[PDB]
């Protein structure tokens, strides 16, 4: 029997640096967890103790920090071949600088295979990227050979930016074709290595015949057998056991995210690369584990440009940027206009003949904004400025609510109005009146959202039975600051860009900003 | 490292056989594809056919079929290919190449086998 | 039997000119694409293999692209050792083709 350790990360974030228990920034040294150097310690352990080891990178190393922001991939790149990984697939946010953001930085300076079976390319794109990416990949581990097929979520035309010439394939349609000539090929060891979700990940070891073990991400899917040794909630044992239409048990693992836990499994092969047992368990990459000095040197090496870049100019504005719990809790601000316009701007996809933009409307709670911004001191706008505005390294996320839902925290936004709560809701695209002399839960007398399905973008009444795309912060879509009807009636929830990074983005493009109120919400 | 090492040069007579060999070192035998591709003067690059030593699953051209035969010898990681009824049209230098997935990465120095009265 | 139509059959250049060899296929080869350097009385190396990744050794000099069926291949600033023969070859479907050659001849 040949065994086969299989170490794998995915939707890592730009986290290099060591985190919090909670993903956030360091603050107590002693107890932090995470980070490419602390990796580096325990892969190059796991190295040394087993003879058959495989490194694998299941998509999202793009987009979550400072870090992404400056460096632009390079830095993915960089650390990647440091840790000496041995295949990545791709993930959407690989995609989120455009697809030339993804073959200059991370396709040409990779040391190994960045693999997808379902992108297909057309256009002038196609000879130029042609062969940057490999839909499968044979890899010789000692003795024996292992086939990597690769594939990435046929969503990712409306989570990111791959542009007018990459088409998205179905999975299952795609991979079974790669994976039937790795078996002319005679590779009898296949993992399908992916980045479309555990629910995906299950139908591919399902349906996908031939895929002996299935490891993926997106859905940030945290797996344990026995007692978690932090603060994630499994969704299942690891690995999650999958019956395949022709009776295979196929093992299916994810490493949760943010590089908190480095994914380990343990397959055993029969001579015809049959699975006789799969084990293992996510390794917690904490205090116990030191970080690598060799690499924690270049992490540091590379912060200096980082802190350089925080006090740097990205823009100028005219007006006051008021960002204060009096305003922002209260009625509409200028600053919650401004981070609502920021986020509706960023999610502008390449989009059809259906729509103008697949999604028009935002939501940001008073709560989420944690300062204003003095357009006193020369008009300048710096990363330092905005990291004041929005502290707690969330995200905007991209959910599908029911009209119904989306009155229903309209009406949660003003249930107890006048106290500086926090659930007050700042928009973009949508048009509220309320009538505060009302009963609480019956004070929206008037929601109107801007259209989709239109040519000409105009205001139309929300419809209860309808669903409506919307861009919120991470922090909401989880029900935070009681808005348990946007997660427990959410129908889509995606895992979108860092809040910071978005609002750098869209001052440092218009340049000069003046953000007025202009009676986007209204009272009595 | 990575080398491929053939039988020598060789002179048959029509209607003869010959057998060329290709011996392997420096990776995992089993594990890897071995091609036969002729190279005849003024007429191009031909392939033939593939074995797998590790199952010794064989797969030739349509052209070449009930011509070529190829085997193998897992002991001193040897591959042999032969060709029965040679003819003039037969006179080419015949290479064995390695492949693991998309292409043939490494080839042997060649074995030249002339065929004439 | 897909046929592979390899232009110009023989070049003429100087070291340090750019060179543009084509590879046109019958039927689309999925990116299967793979580039050989030959020398004359020596064994064929690879250069380049799946249209654009390079083979272990091969200078930066050498890059290769293309998709459906044609397919390019360029040396930026010639060199010395890079006066050879040029095959092309499909890995897509089987019986595998080869093109028909680009002999490489020092300019004088």
């Known amino acids: 029997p040949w065994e086969l350790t299989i170490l794998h990360t995915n939707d890592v974030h730009s986290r290099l640096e060591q985190t919090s228990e909670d993903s956030s920034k360091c603050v107590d040294a002693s107890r932090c967890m995470g980070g490419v150097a602390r990796l580096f310690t325990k892969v190059q352990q796991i190295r040394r103790a087993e003879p058959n080891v495989l490194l694998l990178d299941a998509g999202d190393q793009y987009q979550g920090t400072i870090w992404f922001t400056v460096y632009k991939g390079a830095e993915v790149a960089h650390f990647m071949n440091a840790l000496r990984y041995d295949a990545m697939a791709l993930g959407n946010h690989e995609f989120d600088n455009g697809v030339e953001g993804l073959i200059e930085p991370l396709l040409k300076e990779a040391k190994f295979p960045i693999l997808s079976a379902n992108i297909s390319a057309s256009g002038p794109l196609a000879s130029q990227i042609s062969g940057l990416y490999l839909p499968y990949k044979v890899l010789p581990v000692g003795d024996e050979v292992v086939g990597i097929v690769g594939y990435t979520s046929k969503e990712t035309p409306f989570l990111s930016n791959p542009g007018t010439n990459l088409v998205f394939e179905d999975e299952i349609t795609a991979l079974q074709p790669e994976v039937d000539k790795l078996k002319t090929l005679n590779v009898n060891k296949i993992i399908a290595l992916g980045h479309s979700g555990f629910e995906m990940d299950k139908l591919i070891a399902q349906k996908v015949r031939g895929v002996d073990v299935v490891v993926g991400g997106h859905s940030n899917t945290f797996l344990y057998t026995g007692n978690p040794p932090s603060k994630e909630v499994p969704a299942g044992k690891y690995p999650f056991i999958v019956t395949s239409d022709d009776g295979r048990k196929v093992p299916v693992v994810q490493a949760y995210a943010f590089g908190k836990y480095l994914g380990y499994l343990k397959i055993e092969f029969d001579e015809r690369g049959n699975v006789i047992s799969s084990h293992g368990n996510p390794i917690l990459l904490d205090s116990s584990i030191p970080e690598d000095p060799s690499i924690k040197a270049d992490i540091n090496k590379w912060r200096i440009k980082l802190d350089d870049y925080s006090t740097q100019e990205l823009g100028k504005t005219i007006v006051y940027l008021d960002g204060s719990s009096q305003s922002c809790r209260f009625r509409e601000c200028n600053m919650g206009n401004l981070i609502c316009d920021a986020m509706i701007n960023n999610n502008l996809r390449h989009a059809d003949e259906m729509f103008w933009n697949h999604v028009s409307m935002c939501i940001l709670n008073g709560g989420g904004i944690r300062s204003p911004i003095d357009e006193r001191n020369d008009g300048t706008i710096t990363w330092e400025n905005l990291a004041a505005v929005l502290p707690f390294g969330g995200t905007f996320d991209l959910v599908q609510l029911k009209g119904s839902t989306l009155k229903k925290a309209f009406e949660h936004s003003v249930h107890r109005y006048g106290q500086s709560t926090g659930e007050f809701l700042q928009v973009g695209g949508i048009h509220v009146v309320y009538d505060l002399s009302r009963k609480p839960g019956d004070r929206v007398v008037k929601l109107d959202v801007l259209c989709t399905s239109c040519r000409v973008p105009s205001y139309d009444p929300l419809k209860m039975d309808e669903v409506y795309k919307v861009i919120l912060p991470n922090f909401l879509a989880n029900g935070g600051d009681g808005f348990q009807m946007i997660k427990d009636e959410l129908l889509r929830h995606d895992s979108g860009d860092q809040d910071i990074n978005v609002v750098s983005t869209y001052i440092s493009k218009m340049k000069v900003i003046y953000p007025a109120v202009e009676g986007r919400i209204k009272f009595s | 490292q990575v080398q491929l090492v053939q039988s020598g040069a060789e002179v048959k007579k029509p209607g003869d056989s010959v057998k060329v060999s290709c011996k392997a070192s420096?990776?995992?035998?089993?594990?890897?594809?071995m091609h036969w591709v002729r190279q005849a003067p003024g007429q191009g690059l031909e392939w033939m056919g593939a074995?797998?030593?590790?199952?010794?699953?064989?797969t030739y051209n349509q052209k070449f079929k009930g011509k070529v035969t190829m085997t193998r010898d897992t002991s001193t990681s040897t591959v042999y290919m032969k060709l029965s009824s040679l003819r003039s049209e037969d006179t080419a230098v015949y290479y064995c190449?390695?492949?693991?997935?998309?292409?043939?990465?490494?080839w042997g120095q060649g074995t030249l086998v002339t065929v004439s009265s | 039997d897909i046929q592979m139509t390899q232009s110009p059959s023989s070049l003429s250049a100087s070291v340090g000119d750019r060179v543009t060899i084509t590879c046109r296929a019958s039927?689309?080869?999925?990116?299967?694409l793979n580039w050989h350097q030959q020398k004359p009385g020596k064994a064929p190396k690879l250069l380049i293999w799946?249209?654009?990744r390079l083979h272990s050794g091969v200078p930066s000099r050498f890059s290769g692209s293309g998709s459906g069926t044609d397919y390019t291949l360029t040396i930026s600033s010639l060199q010395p050792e890079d006066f050879a023969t040029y095959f092309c070859?499909?890995?897509?479907?089987?019986?595998?083709?080869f093109g028909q050659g680009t002999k490489l001849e020092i300019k004088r």
């Open positions: 190449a390695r492949l693991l997935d998309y292409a043939m990465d490494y």
């Open positions: 420096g990776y995992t035998f089993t594990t890897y594809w």
């Open positions: 074995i797998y030593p590790g199952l010794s699953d064989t």
């Open positions: 039927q689309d080869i999925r990116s299967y």
């Open positions: 799946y249209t654009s």
């Open positions: 070859q499909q890995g897509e479907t089987l019986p595998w083709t």
